[PDB]
Structures are given as C-alpha cells and as structure tokens.
Amino acid sequence: KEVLTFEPVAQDMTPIIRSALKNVKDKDLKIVFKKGTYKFLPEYASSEYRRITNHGNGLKKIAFSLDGFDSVEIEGAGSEFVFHGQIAPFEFYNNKSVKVSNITIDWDIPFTFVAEVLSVNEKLGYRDVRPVKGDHQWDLKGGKIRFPNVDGFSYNYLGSTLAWDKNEKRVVHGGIDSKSKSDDVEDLGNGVLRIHERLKDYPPVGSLTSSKGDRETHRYAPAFQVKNSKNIVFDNVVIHHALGMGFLFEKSEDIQILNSGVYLRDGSERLISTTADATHFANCKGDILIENSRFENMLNDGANVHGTYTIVDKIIDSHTVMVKFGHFEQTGFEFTGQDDEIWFIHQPNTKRESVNTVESVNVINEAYTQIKFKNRLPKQLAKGDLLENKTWNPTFTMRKTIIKNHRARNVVLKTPLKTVIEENFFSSMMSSILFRGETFFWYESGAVEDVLIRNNTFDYVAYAGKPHAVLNITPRLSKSFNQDEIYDRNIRFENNTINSFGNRIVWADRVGGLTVSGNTINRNINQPVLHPDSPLFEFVNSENIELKNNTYNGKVQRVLIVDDSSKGTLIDDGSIK
C-alpha cells in the first residue's frame, strides 16, 4: 500500500500530480494533501479519449485519473482544489474501493455569463444587461459576446438562458428557458451591453440571467466520473463549479454521498454551481445512499438514478441481437456484459416481458452493440423492441438532504428496486419528485416498483412557467407502444408538508397503486398562480389510487381532476373537499 503526500509547492500542481500518479505500482493507494489551496491547469495534464454518459465524448484533459486500483483514497483534509479551463478533475475507473473526503472543488473562472437585466424593449427586439464582474470573464469581438475566453476557448453564443432572482439566487417565479443566439451586441459604456435579438419570452427587469454556452460543447466533463467501481464513498466533498455534472456514476455499485454538496460559495458573486446534474447514477447497482447533503444552484437535476433503454436493430442468430443507443450522448456507454440479466420489451407492450442472461458482448462501435445470450432469444423479438438491463439497477435512499434554488426537478427516480426519500427539505422550480420513463428521446429506463416518499418538507415547489407538480408521474414513451398501459407501480407519498402558492401537488399518469396519505398542504406562499384552476391532484389512466387523511389549509383550490378509468379504482376518504 502506497501513501503519497503533497504540499502546495508550485503554482500549477498538475505536473506534480501527473508524474507521481504515473509511477504508482501497488493496487492500494492513498493520497493526502496538507490543507491548502491547490491550483490545477490543463496545459500539462494527461489527455485520453473518454466516453462520458449524458456528456460529450472526446479527448479530455484529466487532472486526477485513477484506474485499476483495489482501493484508492484521497484525503483532502479541508483543502480547496481550484481548476482552470476545460478539464476533468477526477476519474475513478475500475476500482474495487473509492473514497474521497474533505475537499472543495471550484474554478478560477467559471464557464458562465451572468448579467443583470436593466431594460427590455419587445417592440425593437433588444435587452440591456450589465454583466456581473466577480471572477467572470468576457469581452466583445465581431459584434458578438465571447466568454469565458479561457485558454483560447469561447462559446459561439450565450446558449440556453434563464432568469434568476438577484436576492435569493433562485429561478424567478414563472421563469422559463430562454435561448439566446444574438449576433449583434453593442457596448454602451457603463459596463452595459445591448443584446439585439427578438426573444420568445424576455427576462424580467432586475433578474439575473444565466448562460451556460453552446449546447454542443458545454458538457465537457463532470467534477467526478466513477465508472465500473464498487464501494465508493464521498464524505464532506463540496463542488462549487464543474463543466458538467457534479457526481456522475456509470455502472458502479454501493455508492455513498455523505456530508457532501454542490452549491455556491458564500460571499461570492457566482450564480450557478454546476452546469448540469448535481448527482447522476447511470445503470448502477447495489445500494445508493445520499445523506446529510446539500445541492443548490445547479443548471439541472439534483439527482437522477436511471438505466439505459437500447433499441433492437437486427437479429443476428437464435442467441445474438444487435442493439443501438437512442440518445447521442449515450453512445459509448458500457451497456452490459457477461452474466448480466436483461429485460426484453416487445412493441407495443411497455411491460418487461422476459429475462435472459448475457454470455458475451461484441461492441461494434459506440452506437451499436452485439449481445450473445446464454438462452434462446424471444421468438417475437423484432426491430424496434427494447432491451433493459435487469442486473444494473440500484436501491436508492436520500435522507436528511437539502435540494433547493436550481433549474430542474429535485429528484428523478427511475429504478425498479426499493427507493426511500425521507426527511428531506425540497424546493424546485420544476417538479420536485419526477418519474419519467423515456423511450421517445432520452431512452432512460426505470419503470419503478417500490418507492416511498415520507416525512419530507416541500417549500416553494413548481413555480416554473411550464406546468409541474410536487409529485409528477409522467412517462413519455414511443408511439410504437400503447400510450395507456400501466407503467409505474407501488408509489407512496406519506406524511409530507407542502407549502403551496397554488401549484399542483400530484400529477399521475399510468400509475398502478398510488397512496397519498398523511400530507398537510399549506397555502401560505404569497406568489401569483401561473396556471389558473389547476387541481391539487390529477390522475389519468391509472389504477388503485388512494387519498387518505390529507389536510389542506388556505384559500380554496380545485381538488381533483380524474379520468373515468382511474376513478373506478380511486379511494377518496374526503379528507380534502
């Protein structure tokens, strides 16, 4: 077992880490840093081609690459790691044990463009903004905004854009995603720019506008990428910035995120923490635990545990099938391997039909995968059918965690195993707890079968411009399948406290078995209703839904909209009338 210790010696700690890690020999490694501020530039960092799920594949500059260890541990001892430019901070590949603790990750210059809106003129089609200085970087060239101008990199445009409250640093009431692609930006002095373009929906005056950049290149790498690893623990790990997601896990087992978080540094002038999901679990298995954590100010979901839906392309023989990935950012994923159990899904039935076990895998390219099974393939297997990995599905538990003030759903649950969401504080612009089985555009599996959401606090939920709800069960499946079959099952929403401004509470679609009990709804938020006459609960094409011992306080609101199919099995004790 080797133990490497480091001090803040040089202004760029990348070459020292690269050389020390390159000469490691044993399979048990521990790295200790004396508490200080370490800076890492990508200029002299190692470069490898990487396949990153829900990110863009390509050549990556990597600061910490740890591959093949029996156990690897990184002790930061409260150190702060400052990164620069387009770089991947940490990569943990093929490790039977991973532990990172007591560390803070940030960038010297963030890859965002934040500006305060001064005035908006919809008639002429321009907006006057004052960019926040802080540690942001930007300039003008060719009548176009260039940012962040780090190591010669700059996005073509501001890209997708959102309005934020300057005081609370959260998405504004009724805020929606803007897309800024302006070609004419003027400098009026005063540190004020006039951006010429006719937006569909303009940001409010006084709000702060966030911009991540071009959609094609802003997902460079997550702060942490864990691939094919087991027994991973993150303890007291804070992420202030990342050119992508915060914690990304691919095909891993027994993951723990404790006392960690992704949020803004207090006293700073930053608006966004991570440009993508805070935590992400793609086809993991074993157990996943998130406890005593805090995720805010991300540009995407707080958590998404899900698997991959692959599409049958061709039948090779009686035991071999070739599948294709559905989403462009899913190509290169390690879908399956030997001894994996796989669910077969035949059009137009959305349910898991049969199970088979993989014998071998022949990867043709990043898009197509040839799978040979131990048993005979289903006789009805045809092109367009789906494969879902049965082995790689985790149990999920999120408790005593804070998720607020960011642009997405709070928690997205797509695992068929036992899921427990308890004792959390939640606040979401969009839906808070979302279920979206997707075979239309994202191809993310996870029809659920055991989910429990109890004793949580929901405050200021679903204040986006588009309609949402605290608990939103809305699968989006390909039209090659029937659109009225039961998809999700056995979801319980118990003993929660919802502070409402007039938002939907529960919107269920194709749920089989849904218990909404013991909840207290408090109409105590002084915010205007964005979708008038929206009911607390709406159910469509569902079965065996039960309302029981719920309480509503405040101004009256429409209670229930239900289709004739789910009404035949709905149990309503009239606790809210």
Ligand X SMILES: O=S(=O)(O)OC[C@H]1O[C@H](O[C@H]2[C@@H](O)[C@@H](CO)O[C@@H](O[C@@H]3[C@H](O)[C@@H](OS(=O)(=O)O)[C@@H](O)O[C@@H]3COS(=O)(=O)O)[C@@H]2OS(=O)(=O)O)[C@H](O)[C@@H](O)[C@H]1O
Q: Which of 67, 177, 214, 450 binds ligand X (CB under 6 A)?
A: 177
Q: Are the beta carbons of 195 and 126 closer than 8 angstroms?
A: yes
Our CB check for ligand X shows the closer of 29 and 434 to be 434
Our CB check for ligand X shows the closer of 103 and 226 to be 226
Q: H-helix or E-strand containing 120?
A: strand 115-121
Our CB check for ligand X shows the closer of 76 and 175 to be 175
User: What CA–CA distance (Å, rounded) separates 467 from 465?
Assistant: 6
The reply on whether position 366 binds Mg ion by CB under 5 A is no
Residue 243 Cβ, how far from ligand X at the closest point, in Å? 13
Our CB check for Cl ion shows the closer of 540 and 576 to be 576
Q: What does the DSSP assignment read for 7-19?
A: ---SS--HHHHHH
The reply on whether position 217 binds Mg ion by CB under 5 A is no
Q: Which amino acid is at 424?
A: N
Residue 472 Cβ, how far from Cl ion at the closest point, in Å? 22
Range in contact with Mg ion (rule: CB under 5 A) among 151-159, 283-291, 322-330, 385-393: 322-330
Our CB check for Mg ion shows the closer of 57 and 544 to be 57
Residue 97 Cβ, how far from ligand X at the closest point, in Å? 27
How many C-beta atoms surround the C-beta of residue 539 within 10 A?
Answer: 27
Residue 175 Cβ, how far from Mg ion at the closest point, in Å? 28
Range in contact with ligand X (rule: CB under 6 A) among 83-91, 434-442, 485-493, 530-538: 434-442
Range in contact with Mg ion (rule: CB under 5 A) among 259-267, 323-331, 453-461, 532-540: 323-331
Residue 242 Cβ, how far from ligand X at the closest point, in Å? 13
Residues 533-572 that bind Cl ion (CB under 5 A): 551
Where on the phi/psi map is residue 292: left (φ > 0), alpha (ψ -120 to 50), or beta? left
Q: Which of 57, 347, 357, 515 binds Mg ion (CB under 5 A)?
A: 57
Q: Is the dihedral of CA 526, 276, 180, 206 positive or negative?
A: positive
Our CB check for ligand X shows the closer of 64 and 147 to be 147
Q: H-helix or E-strand containing 446?
A: none
Minimal CB distance residue for ligand X:
54
The reply on whether position 313 binds ligand X by CB under 6 A is no
Residue 231 binds what, of Mg ion, ligand X, Cl ion, none (CB under 5 to 8 Å, by partner type)? Answer: none
> What is the x/- site pattern for Cl ion, positions 31-60, by CB under 5 A?
-------------x-----xx---------
SS3 18: helix
Q: How far is CA 397 from CA 29, 415, 445, in A?
A: 29, 11, 18
The reply on whether position 54 binds ligand X by CB under 6 A is yes
The reply on whether position 275 binds ligand X by CB under 6 A is no
The reply on whether position 445 binds ligand X by CB under 6 A is no
Q: How far is CA 302 from CA 17, 238, 271, 281, 575, in A?
A: 31, 14, 16, 11, 32
Our CB check for Cl ion shows the closer of 365 and 526 to be 365
Residue 325 Cβ, how far from Mg ion at the closest point, in Å? 9
556 contact partners, CB below 8 Å, separation of at least 6? none
Residue 57 binds what, of Mg ion, ligand X, Cl ion, none (CB under 5 to 8 Å, by partner type)? Answer: Mg ion
The reply on whether position 329 binds Mg ion by CB under 5 A is yes
Q: Are the beta carbons of 432 and 402 closer than 8 angstroms?
A: no
- Structure tokens belonging to residue 541: 């094409």
User: What CA–CA distance (Å, rounded) separates 286 from 336?
Assistant: 16
Our CB check for ligand X shows the closer of 194 and 219 to be 219
User: What CA–CA distance (Å, rounded) separates 235 from 75?
Assistant: 10
Q: What does the DSSP assignment read for 280-345?
A: EEES-EEEEEEES-EEES-SS-SEEEEEEEEEEEEE-SSSEEEEEESSGGGTT-----TT-EEEEE
Our CB check for ligand X shows the closer of 75 and 329 to be 329
Residue 252 binds what, of Cl ion, Mg ion, ligand X, none (CB under 5 to 8 Å, by partner type)? Answer: none
Closest listed residue to residue 130, CA positions, set 183, 240, 205, 199: 205
* Residue given tokens 């934020």 in the structure block: 164
Range in contact with ligand X (rule: CB under 6 A) among 297-305, 448-456, 533-541, 547-555: 297-305
Range in contact with ligand X (rule: CB under 6 A) among 162-170, 437-445, 451-459, 504-512: 437-445
Length of the chain: 577
Q: Which of 91, 444, 449, 488 binds ligand X (CB under 6 A)?
A: 444
DSSP H stretches of helix in 7-109: 14-22
Minimal CB distance residue for Mg ion:
329
Torsion, Cα 103 109 111 116, to 10 degrees, reads 110
Give the distance between the most distant pair of CA atoms in the chain.
72
Q: Which of 4, 12, 15, 381 binds Cl ion (CB under 5 A)?
A: 15
User: What CA–CA distance (Å, rounded) separates 64 from 92?
Assistant: 8
266 contact partners, CB below 8 Å, separation of at least 6? none
Q: Are the beta carbons of 269 and 294 closer than 8 angstroms?
A: no
Residue 442 binds what, of Cl ion, Mg ion, ligand X, none (CB under 5 to 8 Å, by partner type)? Answer: ligand X
Residue 50 binds what, of Mg ion, ligand X, Cl ion, none (CB under 5 to 8 Å, by partner type)? Answer: Cl ion
Binding region for ligand X (CB under 6 A): 54, 160, 177, 215, 276-277, 300-301, 304, 408, 412, 436, 438, 442, 444, 466
> Which residues of this chain interact with Cl ion, rule CB under 5 A?
15, 44, 50-51, 551
Residues that bind Mg ion (CB under 5 A): 55, 57, 329
